[PDB]
Amino acid sequence: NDCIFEVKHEGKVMGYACLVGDKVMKPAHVKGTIDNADLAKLAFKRSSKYDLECAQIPVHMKSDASKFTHEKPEGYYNWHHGAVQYSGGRFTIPTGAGKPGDSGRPIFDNKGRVVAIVLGGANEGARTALSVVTWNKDIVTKITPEGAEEW
Amino acid sequence: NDCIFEVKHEGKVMGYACLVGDKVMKPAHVKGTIDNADLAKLAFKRSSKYDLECAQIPVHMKSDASKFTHEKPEGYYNWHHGAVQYSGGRFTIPTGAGKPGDSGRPIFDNKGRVVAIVLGGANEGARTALSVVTWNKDIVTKITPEGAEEW
């Protein structure tokens, strides 16, 4: 609710940035800069294998970061536009929800812990498969279904 | 309540000393002399890596000793100035509580067991994070977040 920030370029919104744990995360293909004055001066690392950039969280903004976990049992999860379903190791959303410019929305569990960041998605008639990045013990990983298109 | 004695220097209070297990403990950066007559004659050992000093308790005062453990599950804990929450491996308290000169207070469990001793801490906007010295099986360890200041 309060931990999400907007990235703007020439008055337009193209994507979002999120604060997780003790690092700031942002999709690689999204251009522009951060609206907040303090965060815009940070130096970033870049990695074209996972389409992520990160930086260290400043001291006085630490209280606003969310929690995170790595257990992913089957069930239902929530995000901004409703309920999302997890079964077979894959993320699915009802068709028609979501448009270009909405990349970077976190996905929450029943207790408000962050598990993933969405970037892009696939096309299908009845149900839509998502393109997501998650993490495990001491690594990060990228999952991309067939035919996905960037958001 | 009964296990704590006060250390003074030129009429000013600087800190506290506790009787845990079979050992007498005190933070290193605090100067002065112990109020109690019996404890003032002991010899102490020093270690600047952990910021602790210790000495062995005399025979006749052992009846006042507290119990202790090393189990640290997630949940809620309490001390003199309120309740303290432990989650994510860190201790946090509401901002503004705690002033320099209170260092050395024990942190208590639900059944009265001692689990930690507080020395210093770091201050941010809505919360504060503590720097604490704890133990484990057969050793002691020090934990310190960024920007911490002594108390």
Curated annotation (Swiss-Prot), chains A, B:
The N-terminus contains a nuclear localization signal and a CRM1-mediated nuclear export signal. The C-terminus functions as a protease during translation to cleave itself from the translating structural polyprotein. A motif (Nuclear export signal) lies at residues 34-44. It is found in: Virion; Host cytoplasm; Host cell membrane; Host nucleus. Residues 3-151 form the Peptidase S3 domain. This is Capsid protein. The chain holds residues 111 to 261 of 1248 of the full protein. The record marks 77, 110 as: Involved in dimerization of the capsid protein. Residues 45-50 are annotated as: Interaction with spike glycoprotein E2.
